[PDB]
Amino acid sequence: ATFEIVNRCSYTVWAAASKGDAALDAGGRQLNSGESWTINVEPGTNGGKIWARTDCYFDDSGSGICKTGDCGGLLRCKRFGRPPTTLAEFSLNQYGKDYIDISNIKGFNVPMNFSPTTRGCRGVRCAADIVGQCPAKLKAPGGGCNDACTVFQTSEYCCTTGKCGPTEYSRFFKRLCPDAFSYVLDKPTTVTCPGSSNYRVTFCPTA
């Protein structure tokens, strides 16, 4: 499966691709406005995540800081980015099928469009201006909009035992972005796609 990552945002983003334990292809690249970054994700990839890191600085070695989505300080990510981050989550080749979705479970930082380039399935979009309408407590001082579990650390927001339900802060992400996951046990908006499909992740699709 080939993923094309496009930065349509006016500002520079540092795209990142990782499955938590290892990197996906390069695992991270600076994306100027309008730049497209093509990566090859190995088939059978389970639980891969693509997100955008904003306001990043890096030395020649590749170690630096990001205001949102920093993955241990490295340009090329080996683990998942730190909240808040809009997440494009995909599981490839799962019994002859592919599974994609966009998640606000870890907050929000950049509007995202996750669409398949090949025929078969529909794409997901979370392009609502969540940061502007972000509630006061969920506001991350370094940009973006945090989730509830990151801010408050309670069994209800975090769904530790998988018995939680919707809250104030989950319904906020749900009302702005209906097509994305607001919390762990949210009704699945995951789109099923033909196996071995190709995708495109776009930051700021509407603008």
Half-sphere exposure at residue 152, Cβ-oriented, CA atoms within 13 angstroms: 16
- Yes or no: domain 1-207 corresponds to CATH 2.60.110.10: yes
Q: What DSSP state is assigned to residue 23?
A: B
User: What is the resolution in angstroms?
Assistant: 2.5
Q: What DSSP state is assigned to residue 24?
A: S
3-state secondary structure of 171: helix
The CA distance from 132 to 140, in Å, is 12
The pair phi, psi for residue 150, each rounded to 5°, is -65, -40
The candidate with the shortest Cα–Cα distance to 68, out of 88, 89, 51, 82, is 82
Half-sphere exposure at residue 109, Cβ-oriented, CA atoms within 13 angstroms: 28
The CA distance from 88 to 141, in Å, is 23
3-state secondary structure of 170: helix
Tokens of residue 67, six digits: 């205001």
Helical H segments across the chain, by residue range: 148-152, 155-158, 168-176
Task: Give the DSSP H/E element, type plus range, for residue 169.
Answer: helix 168-176
Q: How many residues does the chain have?
A: 207
Would you say 16 and 51 are in contact if contact means Cβ atoms under 8 Å apart?
A: yes
